[model samples]
Target: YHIDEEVGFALPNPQENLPDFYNDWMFIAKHLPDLIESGQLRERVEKLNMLSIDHLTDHKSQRLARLVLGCITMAYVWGKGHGDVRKVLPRNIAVPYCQLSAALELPPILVYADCVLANWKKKDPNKPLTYENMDVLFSFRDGDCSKGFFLVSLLVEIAAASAIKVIPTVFKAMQMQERDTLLKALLEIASCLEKALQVFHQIHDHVNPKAFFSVLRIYLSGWKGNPQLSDGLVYEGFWEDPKEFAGGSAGQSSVFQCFDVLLGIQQTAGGGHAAQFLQDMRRYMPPAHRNFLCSLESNPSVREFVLSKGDAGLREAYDACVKALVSLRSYHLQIVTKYILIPASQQPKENKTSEDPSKLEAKGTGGTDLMNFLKTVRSTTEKSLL
Candidate 1:
């Protein structure tokens, strides 16, 4: 709903359950005119005078610093000295490539327009405006262009949002202090983006390009602190239950498998598969652990990058994959073997605490799901060669 005028996309059939945090839909309500009058949007951008960043050398600032990077890099629209934003920040906190793709799809030149608007100090309300207002605006648009743009925008938002979601959970798992703002901004963008995307392609005759959005919505809905769905969401053939493996039936797929199907559905989308799984696992694990596990894309991207051309793109991809795999390995080490399966095997399965602490002392200090997954994945690569 980030636009100004009326925009109507198809409604989702039966409707997927959306989370409470999906508030960014108001962006359309706030920025539809800016979108339609794309030329004017460029002139409207103002440099964010965030004076807090100067203090980043302090530990609290550094620990909470990722949000600052995300805000300035992905959301703000400063001029002249804008390049310094990218230059001074650490590479890890840099906004991901998916956001660039979103910018390309917009009518205006702003990449983080939605994010910026979301963060802007509202004249009326003390709270920054939600994207829900934008959703209402999207409902007023003339054609599918708004819908298409919304879908693309959703992808970018989700990319940022995933970073937000993972960063805190990963931080918590690692026993770090609360660094909520960065993730909050990211999740806000992601929620609004998806809500906008959902409005466009919700009701289709068959599956179309927007199928992934539908799948994502359905999957995310299950994770709203619900025990039953969280335990395992069964959608006919595809499922989110890892327990199907325990019952000795390969037929019932894990939530990981559901992601695998959606990944195949959007194979042309050109993102790493298993990333969603790795990200989702962040919610379940402590932040401080490390290990190894490779998703499909990371494994191949790692292998191809290291062996074939040694190109920077491929190498970076490999490194990211390695980090992702290591994070997953840490998950297995801390969760499956060390926490859940181990304690369950020893005592009654039902008696285990949902908030079980890891037995191992913090190993390498880096402990997000992304890092742990990569550690395991890198080890796998080395071991396979050996």
Candidate 2:
């Protein structure tokens, strides 16, 4: 029961059944920064970085490179650039991540944040981000290590792109004095959301149900003391301080929350369990990112803008956003049936009951309940918007 260095996220003591990669992850989390500072992590990973996945012979070595690249990318996105250690990742981490992203044919997280999200010229906020932009972005019919990494990264990228780019664009559009411009931007945002959801559908084809749930189970746990649940997993080495903050759920990502902001769809004062759960998940977001979102309630708001001007264009755009959300929720239910309900139905009843206590439980880990919540939110919220 030792804690890692950066954020003191817990790791179970030398346990059987758990893979050695967990230890590798812990070590990398604990020492990667120091190694980056000392050039050791870079030196070792550079030698292993290959242009083609076929070049990598040893599974352990390939896994290590993937882990290293993932950690560096996660830290860069979630670590607030590691407290001014540098504005962004230095070349050591960034170079290998970019190299691997190319080899894997997926954009690195920072690239997703910068080039994909922030790449839009503010002067023309209505720039296009079609699904066809990356052939790899829409290709996820077969589940493999490469596809899994790409899908995971793509989901995060879509979330960030929405929060960072799409929602803000809507917010900014509301402030514009020109009604036509506002409507145009709103329509553009609606199209953007639609494209994002279409890309999300790519995951439904080959996202190995068990594997998807197993990986996400790590970060979806609440605090460690929940009698029925396992301990929370860390993101880039930082866990929620149980005393100070609630744990983050992968299901409660800004991807879903941003819709509320954009559509001016607030949960009632006495909202349901799902609504309250989402409200609490806000604490999981990085401070700067969260603060930026909070600061959007200035002079003109999206809700206020829509209500004040009852234009057909504005309403159409708003409805498009909602429709896309409903579609996403619908897609989620299909995936959940494939991953949870179907496999769950096929499992022998006694074996299911006799499952290990520490084993990954889909319920508490945001597998089934998460989809149910999304379905509820989309159904109830869509009516309210209408």
Candidate 3:
């Protein structure tokens, strides 16, 4: 009944009018909320979102969600899915998680990571499991070489270590009691991480195929292997075999292409602290490369290498390490602060004055100004909630 009688959308036939699609898109984006509100479209979105999560633990939905998240983490996956699959994943996994996410009043990324982490360990043979201890594992300074057996072990250690990376920021940013919940949950996982890291070390030292390949796959799913040299082969999935397609100089093209991934990793992943990581990456890059990952055909060479004729199957692994780290940065930060920060600070006036009837009766539980101000925070961490 509330529908906008004249506001219908179209799939522009680009052959007829080249820029029409984008022109229409801009118009819709600007007025989408208005359209939805006017048409009660929120109900449609809400219902769809509900159905997506209806089978959260169901095999089909879970499989679909992981595949989508994997593609999303790879880059430009969302655009392709923007038409449908994108909506599906959020509807199924992201939406269902949000209900609990909002109730816990935790950041969405933290909840998302928890979903992944839970997904990671579900139905495991180990029955019960544990988390890692970064301080103990990563702090090794002796003959505790981060090489060979330990190399793989360290990789496993870092999976949980990765979670810690954002905890500090999350704790500081949230309400204290909630922040504590996040922290307590993390410490519980930390213990598991420590155990996993140690076991990974033992297995790697012993050349255990199961554990080795498990971490390898997880690493590939995110960091991707650097392609600089022999060690660079660790991240060799983003492209194909140059031997089959790179014109006639297959070998040479392949080598140079692999070199690019290593360079990309080194340029993006600096040997520095967390605060400086993004800043440092920006410092060494040309503007073109800064946001290159945002678009599908953003990198001409990469595009040519991957989709071009006679192209060498030489490209960075689809899972770039630095990118994954950046993705999780906000996740860790939100979790850390949610439990550690908010409660420690002065409570909002409404919260503070409500503790005592005298204060509430004295001033109606505080000012309308205070109530209005908290709503502005709705924008701070938009994606998590939305």
Candidate 4:
């Protein structure tokens, strides 16, 4: 039995109080593409959003609610960006997804990572599992990790480490006393990147690159300002406007913007395009997380802490961050090679000849100039250490 069957949701009591349409998400996911293709998706989406989680009554309905919400959130990010093509689920989808995202207290990425991954092991039943501490050691059951959701979850893990763990600590660390904590956080970030890369390697043979990329490239879209790259790409997703995707480079996770504030790594002259892009995406994060990140950018206790240190002390502290980042980027390169560089035809074929398993398909792709960007950032930081 799946974990949901045993523990049910972490949802509040009176699960029956969820919306009437809560049970209808799987149906929606199946038929949503047709709705988009036919231009009736918005009206149907609005109707679905009007229904509340308060009306859901059974375990299956509650689980389906999360699954549907996850699907909706992914589509909002992946399908709503760029092009003259139909905006599958832009404003209407993004707004309610964010609202439901918080109401459920689960991020869309986590839904893909924790719930969809399958084969997760919990050491302590009483203790809640979270991305931050979920198994320093875990493995995927064979054939289970071959799906699209697992790939999406891998990218999400990368973002979680950089944005949620590394960036926040870099912003919040105020003293030498915090060095140990920061070091631990850095290790966790490295662990997450390493773990994601390992899983991708094991499953890479089974992954159909063409099927994977064609299915999910939309959400990875970003702003077109990096003229040397993406000159012709249309960036459609935005926080408030329909024009311009939120930002460029998946590795340019909002946390990296916060990372910049502390290290003074990419100091924009009077805050340039990069700065503007980061500020724009702040609206997409959870309200409190967004505000917390904003406040840290403003105050920057970590930068102050480094400034107060002796020259050698500053070098030591900054070096620690750069070193950990270098390790992370190194692992990230493996993922890029496995997922992006290798062509679909060259991809190793899957040997599974047994019963067909349920597969999760969605629209999005994972290649962003992220790996090169990380290496560039790392090299710059390495030079700073000297």
Candidate 5:
């Protein structure tokens, strides 16, 4: 994925100095939570000027603009209330948002890439990027809890940096049949997953499952696989035909996808829509990260290489990776139950109205459907043990 050694897949220290170039958007983004909280975002955004499309030439600025536009667009569409959702994005929001989306190779919706990866900033430049020292550049109406939610996700991305750093090295070792190097890299990756899973626990400390399920979830929804805008959303003046794209799910995170590819994990165990949706999520990742996965797919298989060698030490290390993956997926299963399913039982309509259960909550049955997908994937990882 051409991992930025400094920040892995995250937009490296994303520019916070674009106020002069995009002052109008920055103002709106900075005040979005307040605007959404006060129910004034729609009215305020309706009057926004269409960005001068040509002025946005800097690559980093383009993504920063995308993240800004994504947060504002999705917030406007879903922040109002269940009955107030709009299927067609008004021209002012759609035009600039679609422009940035095309520039950066993302769909015209808030994605995990925009929300979590591109959305973070360090609270203080001197400290490490941890939960407390981190804060989001833009937050939803749910401020502290939402900040914590994304912080944990950001940490998981950072934790996977080790794994992403060695993916090509693992591939090279396989090609050269460097058994010892491959084992070392595999062991390194296993520890990264272990660290990732460790960081995942931060959610329990920061997010209130109730707050996450209902209040903070709407901004994360997308047009595809959602009943609120089931036929997909139309980008007014941007695309004539309505287009459907999946919501922002952690599955879209390149770090998780990288580990899946590096370890040769399969999504097929999570059948039905989960299998299709998880695979489709690759399209939402940054083009480089997505291509990195494909590049590995085209390379020699680590699983097959280990199988052919039939060495006990290699099998042991490979199995350790499987165990770590199993535990990670297993913990994810527990989290779905804790953060989503439990709250889901009490507030189906409330959470479903803001669903990404396919991404966690949907208008109808999306929340419940995720259990099958997650359980299947976890079991599948366990099956990978050699």
Candidate 6:
């Protein structure tokens, strides 16, 4: 979760080559859409039995495993399309997935860290992290949306790196009561957030609402809160009880979480259930990132400082930071409107009448009540303004 000056939140050179036997997972990742379409993906997964989880010795290898295995887990459970669901993930997939997930302090399901922060590689060492220079190893449907979705998110993290660096400074300044230093860092963070929002808009250029809602969204959905698997999903031989983990959502990204913590945006004030829902998403984040967030939660924020001083310049600067964050969340709402809501509304007549559970709620991939939760949190962010 420590942001590198060069790679931002992504792993620095995630390892692609593993021991030869694990190629089944790699082949699954590279050819997921084909396997799903050809009706062979389940068979492929059913036959999988790994030697040991021994060679996943480093962060790079484990992260790559998380991405590959995470994708397979999702595709296997939900890829049969909508209501055709499986309550239990087979042992072959479940054993390594849960084991790696436990090792990394992430969820057994696919998550933002697995798919975005741990999922990319630079095409040329000489180039910067533009979407063009970065590439995803595997994608759903061989289309632009899968790559677009992850790469756009990667750019958002890139846009937030400077802010990430300054976050500790803000906390330290608050501890020292260094108003001038805190004010400078606050403005720096505000500027970075502005850039992050601008990068978020690039999703339109690479992914269309229609394509995301229809083709790719399901692969990111999980069993938790999903009526299709109301009992939650079981990972065979791993747990006796059904486990409920939310799907991958941008909410799991540490970039925005750090921003919220720094600025005193009380996400818990958003609503009881909504706040608790977001709070639970922390388990899906990298352990280090989540620990950093918990550390931030314990510190006093710049918002409290601004209130204490009652100085116009500090108040204005702090508000601008909150304002910039509001703009980012507002833009997030706008994008989700296009990405989920309108697409839900425009479903065809026969399609609407069908038993497909994916259409039941216009939820995000994390399976929150969607529009309600985003609006609540955005409003909660607004309430933070002095």
In order, what is each prediction's RMSD in angstroms?
23.9, 14.4, 28.7, 10.7, 2.9, 2.9
**lDDT computed for candidate 6:** 0.77
Query: TM-score, each model?
Result: 0.21, 0.53, 0.20, 0.50, 0.92, 0.92
Worst 10 residues of 2 by lDDT: 6-15
Tens digit per residue, CA lDDT, model 5, 263-348: 67776234675666667777788888888777866776688888889699998988888898889888988887887777766654
The backbone clash count of each candidate, in order, is: 58, 0, 36, 21, 6, 0
What candidate 6 gets wrong by more than 4 Å, as runs, is 80-82, 175-177, 348-369
Check candidate 2 and list the clashing pairs: none
RMSD in angstroms, candidate 6?
2.9
Worst 10 residues of 6 by lDDT: 348-357
Candidate 6 per-residue lDDT over residues 1-386, each given as its tens digit: 46586556667677767677687788888898899888788888889885468877878888888888888888888765755777789998898788888888887888888888888888997987799998887786755388898889888888877678887787788778788888888888899889888888889889878788777777887767676787788999889999887788878877777778877787844457577877888878888778878887887666777788978878887888889888998998888777776677676212233322233432233333456667788888888888
Error of 2 at 85 (Å): 35
Q: Can you give the lDDT of residue 177 in candidate 1?
A: 26
Q: Candidate 2 or 4, higher TM-score? A: 2
lDDT of 1 at 351: 26
- lDDT (tens digit, per residue) of candidate 4 on 120-231: 3344646654332232111112222324334344334443333344555644544445766655654554454445445434445545555444333333333333221233
lDDT of 2 by residue, 1-386 (tens): 11122111111111112144334333544454464455455334333322333444443344334444554433432232222221233444555455654554333332222212222112222533333232221111123222443434344345335433544456555555666766776666667667666666666554566654433322222333333323332221122321112323344344556556656666522566666766655544433335444664333557666767768777776677677666766766676666545544454211234322222232232332444566677676667564
Off by over 4 Å in 2: 1-156, 159-173, 214-248, 297-299, 348-371
Cα lDDT computed for each candidate against the true fold: 0.27, 0.43, 0.26, 0.41, 0.76, 0.77
Model 4 lowest lDDT segment of ten? 355-364
Relative to the unseen true structure, what is the C-alpha lDDT of residue 274 in candidate 4, on a scale of 0 to 100? 33
- Give per-residue CA lDDT, model 1, range 211-265, as digits (tens): 2221111111111222322232121212233211011010111222222221222
Off by over 4 Å in 3: 1-96, 109-117, 120-197, 202-273, 276-386
